[PDB]
Amino acid sequence: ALRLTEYSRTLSGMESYCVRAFADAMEVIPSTLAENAGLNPISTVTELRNRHAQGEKTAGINVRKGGISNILEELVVQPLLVSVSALTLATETVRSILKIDDVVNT
Amino acid sequence: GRKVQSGNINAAKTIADIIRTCLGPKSMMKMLLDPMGGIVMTNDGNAILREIQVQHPAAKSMIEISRTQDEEV
Amino acid sequence: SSQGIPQLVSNISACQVIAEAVRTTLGPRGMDKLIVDGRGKATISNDGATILKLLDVVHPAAKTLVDIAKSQDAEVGDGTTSVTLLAAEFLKQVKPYVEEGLHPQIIIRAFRTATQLAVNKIKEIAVTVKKADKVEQRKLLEKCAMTALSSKLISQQKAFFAKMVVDAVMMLDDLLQLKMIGIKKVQGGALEDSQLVAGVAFKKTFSYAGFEMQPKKYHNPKIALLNVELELKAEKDNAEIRVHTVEDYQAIVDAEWNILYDKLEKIHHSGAKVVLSKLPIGDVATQYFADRDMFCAGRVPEEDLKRTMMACGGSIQTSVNALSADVLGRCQVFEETQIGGERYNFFTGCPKAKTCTFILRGGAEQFMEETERSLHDAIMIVRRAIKNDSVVAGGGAIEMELSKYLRDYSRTIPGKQQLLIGAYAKALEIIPRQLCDNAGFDATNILNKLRARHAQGGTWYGVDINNEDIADNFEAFVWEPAMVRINALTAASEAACLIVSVDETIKNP
Amino acid sequence: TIRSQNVMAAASIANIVKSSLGPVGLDKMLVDDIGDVTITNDGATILKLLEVEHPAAKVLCELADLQDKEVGDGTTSVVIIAAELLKNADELVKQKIHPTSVISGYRLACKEAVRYINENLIVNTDELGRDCLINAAKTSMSSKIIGINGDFFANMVVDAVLAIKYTDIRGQPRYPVNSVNILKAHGRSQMESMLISGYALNCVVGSQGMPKRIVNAKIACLDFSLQKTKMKLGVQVVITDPEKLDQIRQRESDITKERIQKILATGANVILTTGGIDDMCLKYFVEAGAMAVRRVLKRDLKRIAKASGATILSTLANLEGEETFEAAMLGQAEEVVQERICDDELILIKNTKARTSASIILRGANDFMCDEMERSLHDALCVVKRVLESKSVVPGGGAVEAALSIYLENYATSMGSREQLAIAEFARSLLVIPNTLAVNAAQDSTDLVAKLRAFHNEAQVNPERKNLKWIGLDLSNGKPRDNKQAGVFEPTIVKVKSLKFATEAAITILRIDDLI
Amino acid sequence: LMGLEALKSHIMAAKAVANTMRTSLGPNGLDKMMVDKDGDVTVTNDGATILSMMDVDHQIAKLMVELSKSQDDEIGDGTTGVVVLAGALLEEAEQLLDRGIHPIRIADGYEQAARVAIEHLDKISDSVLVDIKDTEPLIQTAKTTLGSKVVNSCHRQMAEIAVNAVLTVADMERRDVDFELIKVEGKVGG
Amino acid sequence: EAVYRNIQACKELAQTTRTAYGPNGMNKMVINHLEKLFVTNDAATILRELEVQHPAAKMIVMASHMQEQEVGDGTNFVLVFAGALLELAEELLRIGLSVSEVIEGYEIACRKAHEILPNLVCCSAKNLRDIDEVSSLLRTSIMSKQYGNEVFLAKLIAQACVSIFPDSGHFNVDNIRVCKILGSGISSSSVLHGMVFKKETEGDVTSVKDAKIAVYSCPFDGMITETKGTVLIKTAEELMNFSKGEENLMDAQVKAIADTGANVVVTGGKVADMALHYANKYNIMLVRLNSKWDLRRLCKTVGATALPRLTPPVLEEMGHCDSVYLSEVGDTQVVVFKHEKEDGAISTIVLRGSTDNLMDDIERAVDDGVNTFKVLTRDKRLVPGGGATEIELAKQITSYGETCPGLEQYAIKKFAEAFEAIPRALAENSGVKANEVISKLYAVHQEGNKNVGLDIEAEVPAVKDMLEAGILDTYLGKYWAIKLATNAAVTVLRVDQIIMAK
Numbered sequence A: 001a002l003r004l005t006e007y008s009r010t011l012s013g014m015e016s017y018c019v020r021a022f023a024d025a026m027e028v029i030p031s032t033l034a035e036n037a038g039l040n041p042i043s044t045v046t047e048l049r050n051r052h053a054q055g056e057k058t059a060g061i062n063v064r065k066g067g068i069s070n071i072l073e074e075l076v077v078q079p080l081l082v083s084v085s086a087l088t089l090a091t092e093t094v095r096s097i098l099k100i101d102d103v104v105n106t
Numbered sequence B: 001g002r003k004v005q006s007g008n009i010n011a012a013k014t015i016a017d018i019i020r021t022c023l024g025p026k027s028m029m030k031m032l033l034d035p036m037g038g039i040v041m042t043n044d045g046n047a048i049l050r051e052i053q054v055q056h057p058a059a060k061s062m063i064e065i066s067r068t069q070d071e072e073v
Numbered sequence C: 001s002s003q004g005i006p007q008l009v010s011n012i013s014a015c016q017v018i019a020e021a022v023r024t025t026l027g028p029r030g031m032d033k034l035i036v037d038g039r040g041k042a043t044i045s046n047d048g049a050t051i052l053k054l055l056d057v058v059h060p061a062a063k064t065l066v067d068i069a070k071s072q073d074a075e076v077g078d079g080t081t082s083v084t085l086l087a088a089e090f091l092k093q094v095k096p097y098v099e100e101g102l103h104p105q106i107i108i109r110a111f112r113t114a115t116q117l118a119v120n121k122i123k124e125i126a127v128t129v130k131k132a133d134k135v136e137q138r139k140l141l142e143k144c145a146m147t148a149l150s151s152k153l154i155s156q157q158k159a160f161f162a163k164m165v166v167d168a169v170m171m172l173d174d175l176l177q178l179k180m181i182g183i184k185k186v187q188g189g190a191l192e193d194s195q196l197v198a199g200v201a202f203k204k205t206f207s208y209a210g211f212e213m214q215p216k217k218y219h220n221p222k223i224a225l226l227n228v229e230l231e232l233k234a235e236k237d238n239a240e241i242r243v244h245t246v247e248d249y250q251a252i253v254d255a256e257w258n259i260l261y262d263k264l265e266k267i268h269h270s271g272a273k274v275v276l277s278k279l280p281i282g283d284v285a286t287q288y289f290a291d292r293d294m295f296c297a298g299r300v301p302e303e304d305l306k307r308t309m310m311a312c313g314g315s316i317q318t319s320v321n322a323l324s325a326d327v328l329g330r331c332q333v334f335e336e337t338q339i340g341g342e343r344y345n346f347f348t349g350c351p352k353a354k355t356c357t358f359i360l361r362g363g364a365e366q367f368m369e370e371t372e373r374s375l376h377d378a379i380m381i382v383r384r385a386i387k388n389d390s391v392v393a394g395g396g397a398i399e400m401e402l403s404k405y406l407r408d409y410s411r412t413i414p415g416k417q418q419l420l421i422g423a424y425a426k427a428l429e430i431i432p433r434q435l436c437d438n439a440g441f442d443a444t445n446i447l448n449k450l451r452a453r454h455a456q457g458g459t460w461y462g463v464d465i466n467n468e469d470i471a472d473n474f475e476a477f478v479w480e481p482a483m484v485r486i487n488a489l490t491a492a493s494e495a496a497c498l499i500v501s502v503d504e505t506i507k508n509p
Numbered sequence D: 001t002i003r004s005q006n007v008m009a010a011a012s013i014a015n016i017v018k019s020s021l022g023p024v025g026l027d028k029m030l031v032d033d034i035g036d037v038t039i040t041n042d043g044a045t046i047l048k049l050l051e052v053e054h055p056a057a058k059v060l061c062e063l064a065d066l067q068d069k070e071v072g073d074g075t076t077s078v079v080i081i082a083a084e085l086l087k088n089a090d091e092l093v094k095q096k097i098h099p100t101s102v103i104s105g106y107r108l109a110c111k112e113a114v115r116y117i118n119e120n121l122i123v124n125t126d127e128l129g130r131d132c133l134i135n136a137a138k139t140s141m142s143s144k145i146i147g148i149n150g151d152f153f154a155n156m157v158v159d160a161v162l163a164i165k166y167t168d169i170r171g172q173p174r175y176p177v178n179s180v181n182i183l184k185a186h187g188r189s190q191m192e193s194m195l196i197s198g199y200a201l202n203c204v205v206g207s208q209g210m211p212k213r214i215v216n217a218k219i220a221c222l223d224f225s226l227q228k229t230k231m232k233l234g235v236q237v238v239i240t241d242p243e244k245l246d247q248i249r250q251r252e253s254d255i256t257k258e259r260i261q262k263i264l265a266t267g268a269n270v271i272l273t274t275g276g277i278d279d280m281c282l283k284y285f286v287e288a289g290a291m292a293v294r295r296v297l298k299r300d301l302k303r304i305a306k307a308s309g310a311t312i313l314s315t316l317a318n319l320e321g322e323e324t325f326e327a328a329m330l331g332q333a334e335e336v337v338q339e340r341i342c343d344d345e346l347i348l349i350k351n352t353k354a355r356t357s358a359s360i361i362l363r364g365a366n367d368f369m370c371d372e373m374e375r376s377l378h379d380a381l382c383v384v385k386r387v388l389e390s391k392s393v394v395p396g397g398g399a400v401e402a403a404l405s406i407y408l409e410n411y412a413t414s415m416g417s418r419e420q421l422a423i424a425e426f427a428r429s430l431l432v433i434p435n436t437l438a439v440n441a442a443q444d445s446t447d448l449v450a451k452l453r454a455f456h457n458e459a460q461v462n463p464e465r466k467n468l469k470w471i472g473l474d475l476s477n478g479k480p481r482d483n484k485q486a487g488v489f490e491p492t493i494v495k496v497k498s499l500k501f502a503t504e505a506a507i508t509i510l511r512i513d514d515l516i
Numbered sequence E: 001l002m003g004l005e006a007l008k009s010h011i012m013a014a015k016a017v018a019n020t021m022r023t024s025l026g027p028n029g030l031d032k033m034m035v036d037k038d039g040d041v042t043v044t045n046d047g048a049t050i051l052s053m054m055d056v057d058h059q060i061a062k063l064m065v066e067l068s069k070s071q072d073d074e075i076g077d078g079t080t081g082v083v084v085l086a087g088a089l090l091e092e093a094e095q096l097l098d099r100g101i102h103p104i105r106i107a108d109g110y111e112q113a114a115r116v117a118i119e120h121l122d123k124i125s126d127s128v129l130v131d132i133k134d135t136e137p138l139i140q141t142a143k144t145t146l147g148s149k150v151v152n153s154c155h156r157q158m159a160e161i162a163v164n165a166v167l168t169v170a171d172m173e174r175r176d177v178d179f180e181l182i183k184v185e186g187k188v189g190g
Numbered sequence F: 001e002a003v004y005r006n007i008q009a010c011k012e013l014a015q016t017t018r019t020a021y022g023p024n025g026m027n028k029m030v031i032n033h034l035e036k037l038f039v040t041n042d043a044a045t046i047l048r049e050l051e052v053q054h055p056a057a058k059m060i061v062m063a064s065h066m067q068e069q070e071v072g073d074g075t076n077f078v079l080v081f082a083g084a085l086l087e088l089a090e091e092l093l094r095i096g097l098s099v100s101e102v103i104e105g106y107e108i109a110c111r112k113a114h115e116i117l118p119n120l121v122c123c124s125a126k127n128l129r130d131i132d133e134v135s136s137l138l139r140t141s142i143m144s145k146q147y148g149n150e151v152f153l154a155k156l157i158a159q160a161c162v163s164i165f166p167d168s169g170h171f172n173v174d175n176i177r178v179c180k181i182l183g184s185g186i187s188s189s190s191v192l193h194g195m196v197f198k199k200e201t202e203g204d205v206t207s208v209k210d211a212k213i214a215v216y217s218c219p220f221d222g223m224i225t226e227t228k229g230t231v232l233i234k235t236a237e238e239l240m241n242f243s244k245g246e247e248n249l250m251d252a253q254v255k256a257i258a259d260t261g262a263n264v265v266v267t268g269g270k271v272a273d274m275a276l277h278y279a280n281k282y283n284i285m286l287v288r289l290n291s292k293w294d295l296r297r298l299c300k301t302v303g304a305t306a307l308p309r310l311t312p313p314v315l316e317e318m319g320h321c322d323s324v325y326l327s328e329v330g331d332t333q334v335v336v337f338k339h340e341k342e343d344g345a346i347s348t349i350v351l352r353g354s355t356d357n358l359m360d361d362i363e364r365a366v367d368d369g370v371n372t373f374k375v376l377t378r379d380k381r382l383v384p385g386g387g388a389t390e391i392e393l394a395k396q397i398t399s400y401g402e403t404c405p406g407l408e409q410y411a412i413k414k415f416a417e418a419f420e421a422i423p424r425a426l427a428e429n430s431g432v433k434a435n436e437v438i439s440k441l442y443a444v445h446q447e448g449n450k451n452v453g454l455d456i457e458a459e460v461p462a463v464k465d466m467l468e469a470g471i472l473d474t475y476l477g478k479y480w481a482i483k484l485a486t487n488a489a490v491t492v493l494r495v496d497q498i499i500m501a502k
C-alpha cells in the first residue's frame, strides 16, 4: 500500500487515482487482522504504515500476541505465491465485476 | 416473590375456591358444563376434580398432587 | 416512575441526559459546545459552567444538580464539568444497584463514607510543594505554565509567556482578581513583541484627529468617564415664523451646544484630561477636546468601563454634568501608540494596583483566539500554583489513586456498604476516561495503563494530555490544588447523594 | 444485537437454572412434552431435560453435558459462571472493548486462576479429615436433622469410612457407597447405633434349626439353590423316570457332600446359599456340620462377592456340586460371629479379606424416618466419598469462587494490556456463585457476598490471617463459615474443571458474531 | 441529535454550503443569482457577495458563513475557495469518522497538516521584484490576475490606478496600508 | 366501593409522605405556585404544597395540621399511622367485617392506648435549665428532621429557648424567629436575646436605651399629630428640603412621640441614600428590605402595627423596646432589639448556610425543636421513642385483643399492627428490610426490656435501647398524634360515598 501509493503518485490519468484507491482498499486486511486482535485497527494500520515508511520492510500482526512484533523470530511468514495469487485472482474478479453493466436471463 | 409463585398461588386459589363449597354435610351442588351440551351433577370434590379442565400448568400440577394424595387414602 | 426505584431511575436518567451535554466539554483541550438558545443567536464556549448557564435545566434533578455544581463557582479551575460528571457517573454506576431493589439511604451513607475517606486520603497524600523563602519559584511556575500550554508551537515564545505569567504573579499579588486574566487581542505583526503594561488597554480607535498633535505622554491625567452623548446637529430643526432671522433656524442648537461648551469648560477646569464613554461622540466634540488639551475615548464596552472605574476607585456617572468631584481617579501616565495596524490606548499604573494587562501580537487568529480560553486557563493554572498551598496530580491521576484506594478499602469493609464503595471508586474513573476521550485517543487503553501502573510503584501517573500514552502528571507540573479538589469532590458527592435521596417530584397546578 | 442475542439466551438459561444451584435451591417444573410433568431441584437434570430453543443455549448445554460426562456434577456451577461471564463480557463490549481481547483475558484469567487454586488454595486429604470429616458429615446431616441426634451419627460414619477404607491401586482408597451393609431396625432406642466390622446379611431368624449359634472360621458362598421344585436353574422335570424326577435332588444333595468337604478343606464350616434351597436340604449339611444358611438375596450375593472375593461362578459353572470349590469363592476373613444383638441374630463376618467392609444398623422407631436417615446418611457417605476422591480438596460453599475473585482482581492490575480489564470483569463475574448461594437462602446476596469478599480480602492482604483463606457461605445456611474447621468440601478437580469448562464455553459462545 | 450522528448532520449542512460554492470558484465559475424579499435580482461570481446574504438552513452553516465573512479584507479572491476547501475537508472527515476516528484527532491532524502545508508553501515559489518603485511587473500581475474574470475586457487602466493609489499609501507603515483610507464611490452614468 | 377508593387514596398519600419519616427520611422535590424548586424532608411543607384534592386525603392532612398547631412533633406520624389504620381496615373489610365494627374497635383501642401509655412512659424532663440536659431532651426531635449534623442544632435551640423561657411555667410558641442571611458554615450560627434582622440600610445606633419603633410603608413623613409635614417626590431641591423636614420630624418623634413610643421609623419602601445620610447626621436609624411578615413580627413584638398608608401616629400603634443596637454576627451587619421583659418573651437566632434550601431545612428543624420545647414545658413527662413506644403499645393492644372476646378484636389486632407499621416506616427509610428488623425487635421486646427500637446506625437490621441512646419523644406529642390520627381514621372510614353538592 505504501509503495503503490507512491507509484500512483508517480502515475498519470484517472489510473493514478484508481491505483491510490487500490492501495487504500488493500489496507483493509491488516486493519481487519488488527480488528480480530486486541489492538484497535486504525492505530495498528497507521503504525504499520509508519514502520514501513521508516525502513523495517517486514512488520505485521502475529499469532503469538496481538501487538506489532514482526521484526524476526515470532513473525508469521508465508510463501509469496499465496499472496500474489490472492492479488491476481481478486483483481481479475473485480475486473469482471466492474466489467458488468447488467445481468440478463436467457 | 417472582411471578411464577404468584401464578402457582392463583391457580391453587381458583381450584380451592371451586372445591370449597363441596365440604361439609350441607355441601353445595356443582355445575359441570360439558361442551357437548350435557350437565354432570356432583356433590363432592373428587368427582369434579376428576373431570375439571385445568389449562394452567400450576393447577394441573395441583391436580397431579391431588391424584397422589387420593391414590394413597 | 412514581415512587422509590422507578422515580430514582428517571431522575438519574435525567442526570445522565444533562451530563452528556457537558461531559464532552471536560478537559483543557476540551471538545467545546454550541448553544443556540436564548435569543436565536449562536455562541461557542469550552466551559462547562458557561454551557450550563446558557442552557436551561427544566428537569428538577438537573436543576438541583447544576445549582450545586455551579455553587462551587469553578472560578479557579474547570470544576463545574468535573463535579457534574462525577455526580452523574456516581448515579450511572449505582443505577443497576438501586434498580435491583437497593434502599436509597444506605447508598447515601456509602457515598458519605467514601467521600470522607477520599478527602482524608487526598489531604494525606497532597504534597505541599511551595517553599516560601526562596523567590526563584518562578523557575517552576514558568515550567508549569509552559507545560499547561505544551501542545502548541513553543520555540522561544514560551519564555515570553512564562515571564508574562510570573510577572503577572507578582502583578496579581494581592487577591483573587478577574480583569487580570483577559489579554488584549492584536492583529498583525509577529508574535515576538509581547510586553506587560499596567492598568488597561483599549480597542480600535476611530479615525479621529489628534493622534499625535496633542502629545500622548499625558503626565498625571485626571480621568473622566461619561454616559451621555455629544452628537452632531445635522438633523434639521424647524423655526419658520419669519424670514428676517434665518440664523434662528440654527440658534436653537447653538444654545444647546453653548450649554455643552459650558459643561466642557467645567470639565476643563475640573482637571479631567481623557473622557471615557459607552457611546460614540460627535466629531465636532472630538475636535473640541483636541483643541482644549483633552481627549475622547468613547464608544467602548462596559467591561473596560468597570475595569477602569475600579482602577481609579471611582464610579459611573450616568450624566454629562456634575463631574466636578472626586468621582474619578488619577492615572500616572496615559499613552496612545500605533501598534501594528491599529492605534491603541493605555493607562499605565492608574491610582490603585489591582489593574493591569498585557499585549498579545502574532498576526493571526488561530493561536490567539485559542489564547482567549487557553491562556485564560493557563494563568489560572499559575494562580492555583501560587495561591493554593497543596496540589495533587491532575488529569485523572488522583482519580486513579482514589479508584485504587477506595476500591481496596471497599474490599476491606465487611458490610454490604463495600460493594457500593467499590461502585463509587469505579465512578471516580470517569474524569481520566472522559478527559482521555476528549483528547481523541481511545480511553480504554489509557485507563488500563493507569490501572496497571497504580497498585504498585509511583502514584502520580495519569494521562499525558499532550501525548497519547501515560506520564507522571505531577512531574509535568499538571497539578490540581488539594483544597479545590476536596471542595469539587465533596460537591460532586453531595450532588449524587441529593439526587439519590429524593423521591417523587411533586407540583401543584 | 448479533452477539447480545446469544448472551441474553445464555443468561436466560442461567436464570432458569440459578434458583436451584445449592442444596437449598427451589424446585423446577420441567415439561419437555405436554403432561410429562417433572419436579427436580438439581440443575443437572433440568439441563439434561430443558428443551433449549436457541443455538447458543444448545452449545452451552452441550458443553455442560460434556463436563458432566467428563467429571463430577458441577454442571450448574459451569452454566451460571459461564453465563455471568457472558453478560459481563457483553457489558465490556458495550464499553468498546474488542471481543478477542476479552477472549484472551478470560483465557489468561482461567489459567492464572487454576494455577492459584492448585498452588495455594487446595488442601490435601492426607492432611485433612482426621477429625474434620466428622463436622463435614454434621453439615451433611444439617439438611435432614431430625432431633438432637447427628453428632453420634457423625462419629459413626467417620469410624465406618475409616474401617470401610477400600485399599486399592493408585493410592486412592475410596470405597463404593453402596457396598456398606446399612440396616434399618425397629424396636430400638433410635439415638444409639452400633457399628460392627464385616458385612451383614438378611439373617434368618425364627427358623434356624441349623445351629449357627456358634462362631465360625470361614463362610462359603453359593448362588445355586438345590430344590425339590422347578423354581430355579438346574432343576428339571422333563426326565422320563418316576425315580430320577425325585432323586435328581437327592443325588445332587449327596454330591454336595463333596462340595462341603471342599469348603471344609478350604476352611469354611458354614456355607450361605441363595433363596430357593429347601430346609430339608439344609438338614443334609447340618448333619455333616457344614451347615447352610438360607434367604441370602441378590444384593447380599453382590456384597459378598465384591467384599470377600467370593466369586461363586469362578470355577463352579453348572448347578451340580461336582465341580471344584476353592478359595476363589470362599468368604475370606478371620472369624465369623452370629451373636444375638438387639433381639436380632445378625451374621457378621469379622475382618472380611480383600475388602474390609462394615455393617450399619440404623436404629429407628418407624419405617419412614428409618428411610429418611438412610437417605441422609447415604448422602453423608457420598459427600465424604467425594471429598476422598481427588485426594486433594478445596473449600466448598463458594469460598474458592470468592477468594479467587480477589486474586483475579489483584492480578488484573498486575498487567497493562487491554486483557486486564477483562481479567477484572471476570473476577467480579465469578462472584455469582456466592451470590446465587446467598439468594437461595433467605439472607440477601449483597450483604453476605460483601462479608465473604471482605473476609477473603483480609486473607489476601493480612498475611498473618492465612487460615482465613477458606471462609465461605454455608450451603444450607446464610452465614459465612470456616469451611475447613467445619463445613462442606468439594473436590478440587471437579471445580477446577468447572471453571475451565465455564471459561471455554464463554469463549466458544462469545467468539460468535452472526448467524447466516 | 447528539454525538457523531449530530456531527454528521453538521457535515451535511457543510456539504450543502460546499456543493453550492463548488460551481462558483475560479474565473469560469458559475454565478449565483441573489434575490431579496424586495425581489431585486443580481448575478455574481464573488463568493463573498454570495455569502453576504446566504440565509441559514441549519445553524452551523450560518456559523461558518459568518466565519468566512470575517476575513474578507485579507482573504481576497478565493473566499469561495476557502469555503469549498473546508467543505472538502469535512466531506473526507465524514469518511474518517466512518473509519471511527474521534473528531478532535482529525482536527489536530488537520492543524498539523496546515502547519506542514505552510512550511512547504513558503518554499513553493519565487519572489516578484520590488513593489514600490518599478511597479511594471506588478502591472503585469494586476492585469493577469484581475481583469480576466467578469470585466468586459482587461485593460491597463483600472489596475494601474489601483496600484498607484496603493503605492501612494503603501510604504509609511513599514510596507503596509489600511483600507480605512481607501474607499470606492460607485456612481452609474458614464 | 367508595370506602375502598378512599382507603386507596389515603394509602397512597401516607405512602408518598412516609418516605420522609424518621431522621434518615428521604427528601422530595417541591414546586409550589411560586415555582421555586427545593428539596425537603418535612411532612408539614410537603403536604402544604401537595394538592390533596381527594377529600379523604384533605381530611387527614387537615387533621395533621390540627395536630401540628396543637403539638409540634408527630405531624408525619399522623399521616403514616392513619395510613396504616386505613390499610388494615381495608384488610378487615376484605375479610367482610362491617365499617361500624372496625370504627368502634379503633375507638376502644385508642381509649385503651390513651389509658395505658401514661404507664408506658419511662422518664420525665428535669428542670429546663442546664443547657446540656434540655439539649439531650430535644435530641430526638432535632435528629428527626436533620441527620449528620445534629448536636449543634440541639444546643442552638436549647440555648435560644432557655435564654428566653421565663421563670413562670409558661412559654409562647411565637418566640423564636429565624434570620436566614447567607454565608458559609452552619456551625457559625448563634442566638441573641430579642429579635434580629438580616441586613438593612446602614446606621449608627443611638436608640441603645429606651428604644421605640415606628413603622411606615407610606411616604416617609412621620409628622406628629400636632403639626403637618410631608415629603413629596416631584423635584429635587424641594425634595431635599422635605428630607430635612421629616428628619426634623424624626427628631421631634424621638423627643416627644418617644413618650408614646416612636423613635426609629421602619420603612417598607426604599428611600434615597442621601436621605439615609441625613438620618445619620440627625441620629435616627431605620430598617429596609423587610417582608410584610417581618414588619408584622417587629411591630407585634413591640406592640406596634404597620400602617398601610399615610396617617399621623397615635398611641394605638406605638411600639416599646429597651434597646436597639448592632452586631456583626457572621461578619455581616445584623440589627438587634433587646428587651427587659417590658414586652420581651422573644428570642431570635441567626441561621447560617450556603443555600436557601438548606436554610429552609434549618428553619423546619428550628420550628420542630421550639415546638417540642413548648410541649415539654407544659408536659414535662416524655416518652421513649424510636419505635419503642409504638411497639410497646402494639404488644399491649395485642394482649388486650386476646383479652376481648367476640368481635371488635379484629380492629384491636389491626390497631396494634398499625403501631407495628411505624418501625416499618423507620426500616424502609433506614435501608434495613422491615420484616427482619420488626421480628427481631419483637424478639427483644416481648422479654420486657420495653425500651428497644430500630437502631439506625447499624447497617444490619438490629436494635438498641433508646433510653441511654438519647432517642425519646414527647408524651403529649405522641398522645395527641395518636388521638387525632385515630380520629381522622374513624372519620374517614365513616364515609361510604363521595358526593358533590352545589
Ligand SMILES: Nc1ncnc2c1ncn2[C@@H]1O[C@H](COP(=O)(O)OP(=O)(O)O)[C@@H](O)[C@H]1O
Binding pocket: F020, F021, F022, F023, F025, F042, F043, F044, F072, F073, F074, F075, F076, F077, F140, F141, F143, F144, F145, F368, F385, F386, F387, F426, F454, F456, F471, F473
Ligand atoms: N433518632 C430517632 N430514631 C428513630 N426514630 C426517630 C428518631 N427521631 C425521631 N424519630 C421518629 O420520628 C418521629 C417524629 O419525627 P417525624 O414524624 O418524622 O417528623 P415530625 O416530628 O415533623 O412529625 C418520632 O415520633 C419518632 O418516632
